[PDB]
Amino acid sequence: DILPANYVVKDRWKVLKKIGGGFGEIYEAMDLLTRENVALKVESAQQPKQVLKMEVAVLKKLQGKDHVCRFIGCGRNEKFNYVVMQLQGRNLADLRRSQPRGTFTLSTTLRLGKQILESIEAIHSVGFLHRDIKPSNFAMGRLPSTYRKCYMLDFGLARQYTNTDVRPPRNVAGFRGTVRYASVNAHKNREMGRHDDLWSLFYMLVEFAVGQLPWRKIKDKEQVGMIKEKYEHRMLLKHMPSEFHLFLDHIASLDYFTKPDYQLIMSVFENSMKERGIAENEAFDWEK
Ligand SMILES: CC(C)(O)C#Cc1ccc2[nH]c3c(c2c1)-c1nc(N)ncc1CCC3
Ligand code: NA
Ligand code: NA
Ligand code: NA
Q: What is the DSSP string of the chain?
A: --PPTT-EETTTEEEEEEEEE---EEEEEEETTT-SEEEEEEEETT-SS--HHHHHHHHHHTTTSTT-PPEEEEEE-SSEEEEEEE----BHHHHHHHSTTS---HHHHHHHHHHHHHHHHHHHHTTEE-----GGGEEE--STTTTT-EEE---TT-EE-B---BPPPPSS----S-TTT--HHHHTTPPP-HHHHHHHHHHHHHHHHHS--TTTT---HHHHHHHHHH--GGGGGTTS-TTHHHHHHHHHH--SSSPP-HHHHHHHHHHHHHHHT--TTSPPTT--
Phi then psi dihedrals of residue 246, to 5 deg: -65, -35
The answer to whether position 4 is within a domain reads: no
Q: Dihedral, CA atoms, 41, 131, 141, 20, nearest 10 degrees?
A: -30
Spatial neighbors of 93 by CB under 8 A, at least 6 apart, are 134, 135, 136
> CA nearest 202: which of 155, 135, 287, 145?
135
Task: Give how many domains the chain has, as a whole number.
Answer: 2
Q: Beta-carbon neighbour count of residue 232 at 10 Å?
A: 8
Distance 74 CA to ligand 4 centre (A): 19
Burial (0-12, 13-18, 19+ Cβ within 10 Å), 47: middle
Residues 96 and 141 in one domain: yes
Domain that holds residue 219: 89-288
Residues 168 and 222 in one domain: yes
Residues 105 and 212 in one domain: yes
Residues 217 and 245 in one domain: yes
Ligand 1 atom 2 nearest Cα: 154
Residues 134 and 145 in one domain: yes
Ligand 1 atom 5 nearest Cα: 154
Residues 151 and 279 in one domain: yes
For ligand 1, say whether the CB of 42 is within 6 Å of any of its atoms. Answer: no
Q: What is the distance between the alpha carbons of residues 268 and 241, in angstroms, rounded to a whole number? A: 9
Dihedral sign of CA atoms 28, 30, 31, 36 in order: positive
Residues 164 and 82 in one domain: no
For ligand 1, say whether the CB of 128 is within 6 Å of any of its atoms. Answer: no
Instruction: Please name which ligand lies nearest the alpha carbon of 19.
Output: 1
Query: Which resolution, in Å, applies to this structure?
Result: 1.6
Spatial neighbors of 28 by CB under 8 A, at least 6 apart, are 15, 16, 17, 19, 37, 38, 39, 40, 87
Gap between the terminal Cα atoms of the chain: 39
The answer to whether position 105 is within a domain reads: yes
Residue 132: active-site member: yes
Nearest ligand 1 atom to the CA of 88 is: 20
Residues 104 and 140 in one domain: yes
Ligand 1 atom 19 nearest Cα: 87
Residues with Cβ within 5 Å of ion ligand 4?
141-143, 146
Residues 124 and 265 in one domain: yes
Residues 81 and 94 in one domain: no
193 is in an annotated binding site: no
Nearest ligand 1 atom to the CA of 89 is: 21
Task: State the structure-solving technique.
Answer: X-ray
Residues with Cβ within 5 Å of ion ligand 3?
89, 142
Ligand 1 pocket mutation pick from 26, 61, 62, 94 by most atoms within 8 angstroms of CB:
26
